[PDB]
Design an enzyme around this catalytic site. Structure first.
Site, PDB file in Angstrom:
ATOM      1  N   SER A 125      30.484   3.719 -25.822  1.00 25.02           N
ATOM      2  CA  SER A 125      29.908   4.106 -24.533  1.00 25.02           C
ATOM      3  C   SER A 125      30.540   3.392 -23.326  1.00 25.02           C
ATOM      4  CB  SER A 125      28.404   3.860 -24.558  1.00 25.02           C
ATOM      5  OG  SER A 125      27.774   4.540 -25.635  1.00 25.02           O
ATOM      6  N   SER A 141      23.043   3.814 -21.508  1.00 27.92           N
ATOM      7  CA  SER A 141      24.045   4.268 -22.448  1.00 27.92           C
ATOM      8  C   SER A 141      23.623   5.598 -23.078  1.00 27.92           C
ATOM      9  CB  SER A 141      24.279   3.179 -23.488  1.00 27.92           C
ATOM     10  OG  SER A 141      25.600   3.215 -23.919  1.00 27.92           O
ATOM     11  N   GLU A 171      29.490  12.679 -27.365  1.00 25.17           N
ATOM     12  CA  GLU A 171      28.458  11.967 -28.095  1.00 25.17           C
ATOM     13  C   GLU A 171      27.850  12.909 -29.138  1.00 25.17           C
ATOM     14  OE1 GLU A 171      27.892   8.968 -28.191  1.00 25.17           O
ATOM     15  OE2 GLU A 171      28.325   8.029 -26.295  1.00 25.17           O
ATOM     16  N   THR A 192      28.437  -1.616 -21.654  1.00 28.16           N
ATOM     17  CA  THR A 192      28.624  -1.949 -23.049  1.00 28.16           C
ATOM     18  C   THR A 192      29.128  -0.730 -23.803  1.00 28.16           C
ATOM     19  OG1 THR A 192      26.303  -1.461 -23.411  1.00 28.16           O
ATOM     20  CG2 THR A 192      26.912  -3.775 -23.099  1.00 28.16           C
ATOM     21  N   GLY A 193      29.601  -0.994 -25.008  1.00 21.77           N
ATOM     22  CA  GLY A 193      29.872   0.033 -25.974  1.00 21.77           C
ATOM     23  C   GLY A 193      29.551  -0.537 -27.334  1.00 21.77           C
ATOM     24  N   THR A 194      28.922   0.264 -28.174  1.00 18.15           N
ATOM     25  CA  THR A 194      28.579  -0.196 -29.505  1.00 18.15           C
ATOM     26  C   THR A 194      28.771   0.971 -30.452  1.00 18.15           C
ATOM     27  OG1 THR A 194      26.989  -1.683 -28.473  1.00 18.15           O
ATOM     28  CG2 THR A 194      26.869  -1.428 -30.868  1.00 18.15           C
TER      29      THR A 194
END
Ligand SMILES: CO/N=C(\C(=O)N[C@@H]1C(=O)N2C(C(=O)O)=C(CSc3nc(=O)c(=O)[nH]n3C)CS[C@H]12)c1csc(N)n1
Ligand SMILES: CO/N=C(\C(=O)N[C@@H]1C(=O)N2C(C(=O)O)=C(CSc3nc(=O)c(=O)[nH]n3C)CS[C@H]12)c1csc(N)n1
Ligand SMILES: CO/N=C(\C(=O)N[C@@H]1C(=O)N2C(C(=O)O)=C(CSc3nc(=O)c(=O)[nH]n3C)CS[C@H]12)c1csc(N)n1
Ligand SMILES: CO/N=C(\C(=O)N[C@@H]1C(=O)N2C(C(=O)O)=C(CSc3nc(=O)c(=O)[nH]n3C)CS[C@H]12)c1csc(N)n1
EC number: 3.5.2.6
Lengths: 265, 265, 265, 265
Positions: free
Chosen positions: B42, B100, B140, B209-211
């Site tokens: 993200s 996100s 997504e 953030t990105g996860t």
């Protein structure tokens, strides 16, 4: 290459910077002018309370010390509120560490007794810790005033860091007293912009500040990693080149701390 | 030495760590695997929003976007509650960055138009910013699932830092739109334990953030020193060798953050 | 004078508001249209999970249920990500409570078995809890779509509050399963703007939302005061006067919740 | 029924509770001991700053104030660190409001000039705002230590609410200065467990706390509903019958605020 950054900090703030972070199992010691002398300023108040705790049963904390307005010299935000009532040894400790109260420091020194209003016995207590370098010679506020080059009322980042290590992490004090010292340091109100400001919030930081003339600004801290690993951080600074009235630079200590945080990460 | 510290972070956390901080006037570039590919996850949502802001007047944010439960195919903390209400592009931007929100990202991608539901248009937007490396290939939630070694939906810390730099500190967006993006990242709700956790509190950190799977954990931030000096910090990580189910380790990003902070202090 | 504020809220949002807070030892019950029927919507998914946990020896959480894209009905952020994987009952429970996943609810209903795809067994589970009032008649998404006045797929704020009370504060479940249900409710991702938004942050809020047509917006919560006192809060609402397409009003639920918080403080 | 709940709190906390919320267009005033006297403690620091702002062109904020260790006669988290550096009027305002600095307040009182070291000018400023009830008679720290029943250094929830109302929501201050005050109050570091702790997080709370002996705990806030509607909340409390050392109950103020929020929701 860490040293390169501290000396760049020194150039930035026109200051002499002393840092010591004792070696642990996992990290090499951090040393920048670790063995040059810097004035205690109020940082001696933490080992002072350790000395008082050591020499005396917990019960001694309840003894009421009365004093007069003539005894109030130097910054004493708490002692100024208690001339009429007096103050127990215990709260004098509280004021001396958490508020850097100079009158409380003088009363605790006197309570150590002996020549120089307690300074020789406080020096002696540090010696009982293996610190042969440091010395306290004057009371508040004189101990903040010695000129550069003068060994009186000086410690080194090396010696004072190691002292704090024994007081907070070692066995200088029985666990009862070690908890009280650690608690007061943990709730210190004077260090928000120094070592505390240089470490990420999730690092626990207990500290004792010192500030004096010649731009003296010190911070002695025990910091715990997010994982709970303790490190002792001694950060001491002066700007003697700027004369007696040279201003201390709090931002210098916070920056030096962030640098130390970067190597401890 | 910094590379050595990152390599230990990598060893400590069983992870591949990518760090990039563009050079400033006062600091050298910090690069650790700056040009290895890491999955966007993200983190693309921040330049995604920039793209929508860039090719649309501000008033386009008020456009009501309606969608169906069938569009809710990824975690969508905000979009999941507004299937009956619809959501403005403005609200979708806010959700994509601050929460996100996966459906908000797909709807913003759709608003970009073109082949692949906006993914070709968004990649093109990266190209017009000088990023030749990054590519967005899936929507997504597929773009988080690509296996390690696959270049799809990947960027590099180098490239994404440069993109984020132009967006927040450069002139990619007129001040109007730049402020909205900067505000959304600043009030991001997902980054407290990453770059934010590694920088001292008096540093401003805005981040995205990105996860993802394979232990993917990224954080892209613009940070302001207490002096108000800005730095772009891209930290990307995965634990792909631990397979699809590998847990992301946020503390690695905070540790990498602290190391960077120590070099920038 | 509390009914005056709820009816104020009803007037403000052109809404029918149903509120029930069970009496405790120290506080009176709070009742506003506590016994009028409101559509379950997704709030049944929380007692649905309690039913699945109650009748199965826990190991059943690891049972893999596979399903097809034609089974994906209604908002299902998790299930639509696990089609070739299938989903374990545990994941379905987690998905049904924390993401209000409708497909996960239908599979758990089927796992309860029997006529009407599980709705009779789930109703039957409620009867075992002393709720003779509620009934589930359809699966997702039909259960959100019954016209106002239709008793099918309805509960009352009174009924569901007492049901939730037994599930979270009573002994409907053995402590193991009670922990799984409570944790799922606690990490719910769908309720941030409903009961959660109305109570002060230092009040703990675990909840299950429900949303449907005719402006149906429910939230059922167990809240813990700063002192740790639990309260069950059922807040249900619809806007049938606005027809099938009536939009749900989350802010009605947060305001009603705040009103309740004022009485419980 | 609100009064009954305030009385329960008073019983619960062995405390005297003073609450005032001025009427608006939609809400009736909330009054409990609205016209009873409560000790100001540091809540006076907010109108004190307004008094300085009222009397001075913004240019006066950059004026450097120097002081000595003898000026540190009360808790002064900021000023105690700036005896060698001095402090700007702006810094003093900030310190007095955001950190409740006692020394900053005395210097600002002195900046007003006149009999009682600024105390008469500050009371007069309250008089010029229509506050006929309140009075400041002592400086820090004495103004916190008046015995119960003594009218010195007291205000009423009614009076201070109306003062705060004019300062933030009325036209007591031109817009430029009004924002500085609102900004200082908004970033207050001392009110987290009081009115803020009792309002839902999506409510905006700016406040100035007060704490003193006899269990004195005050919080004066301007709060904005989620819809952005402003309300002034004056909450004052002491536990005077419990003697000088009674300690304050912050949860009483948060609980009282929660009550207020429920009526304002
Ligand atoms: C980490 O420190 N942070 C502080 C700070 O400076 N706080 C101080 C601190 O620890 N304080 C203490 C006390 O000593 O217990 C107190 C109590 S002082 C006191 N106690 C008595 O029992 C009494 O009879 N009289 N007085 C005066 C409150 S804050 C000040 C702070 C101030 S504003 C803010 N956001 N933080
Ligand atoms: C198919 O997609 N798979 C995803 C996925 O949707 N990832 C998205 C992504 O990049 N997201 C981000 C974010 O912005 O970082 C996040 C991380 S934020 C977060 N989540 C928590 O559960 C928590 O307790 N604290 N915080 C701060 C949400 S998922 C979304 C995923 C999530 S974990 C995992 N292994 N895969
Ligand atoms: C409490 O709700 N708040 C949320 C929110 O929606 N968070 C969710 C929550 O609990 N999440 C979880 C998870 O399932 O654990 C995750 C994990 S998602 C995931 N994990 C896997 O292991 C995997 O294989 N696949 N996927 C997709 C991240 S946030 C989302 C939120 C959104 S932004 C923000 N700051 N908070
Ligand atoms: C002689 O003055 N006596 C004081 C005193 O200094 N009062 C001032 C006053 O009103 N102040 C305020 C504030 O703004 O509320 C405060 C409250 S700050 C605070 N400190 C904590 O340790 C903590 O845990 N939470 N909080 C919020 C500091 S004292 C100052 C006092 C403090 S406690 C006590 N018994 N007396």
């Amino acid at each position: 290459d860490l040293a390169d950054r501290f000396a760049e900090l020194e150039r930035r703030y026109d200051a002499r910077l002393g840092v010591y972070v004792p070696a642990t199992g996992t990290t090499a010691a951090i040393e920048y002018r670790a063995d040059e002398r810097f004035a205690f300023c109020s940082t001696f108040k933490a080992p002072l309370v350790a000395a008082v705790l050591h020499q005396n049963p917990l019960t001694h904390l309840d003894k009421l010390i009365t004093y007069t307005s003539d005894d109030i010299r130097s910054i004493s935000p708490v002692a100024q509120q208690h001339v009429q009532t007096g103050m127990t040894i215990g709260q004098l400790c509280d004021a001396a560490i958490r508020y850097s109260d100079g009158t409380a420091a003088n009363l605790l020194l006197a309570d150590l007794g002996g020549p120089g209003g307690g300074t020789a016995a406080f020096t002696g207590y540090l010696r009982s810790l293996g610190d042969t370098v440091s010395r306290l010679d004057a009371e508040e506020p004189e101990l903040n005033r010695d000129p550069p080059g003068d060994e009186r009322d000086t410690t080194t980042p090396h010696a004072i860091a190691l002292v704090l290590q024994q007081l907070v992490l070692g066995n200088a004090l029985p666990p009862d007293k070690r908890a009280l010292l650690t608690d007061w340091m943990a709730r210190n109100t004077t260090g928000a912009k120094r070592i505390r400001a240089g470490f990420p919030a999730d690092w626990k930081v207990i500290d004792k500040t010192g500030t004096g003339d010649y731009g003296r600004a010190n911070d002695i801290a025990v910091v715990w990693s997010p994982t709970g690993v303790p490190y002792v951080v001694a950060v001491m600074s002066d700007r003697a080149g700027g004369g007696y009235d040279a201003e201390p630079r709090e931002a210098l200590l916070a920056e030096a701390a962030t640098c130390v945080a970067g190597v401890l990460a």
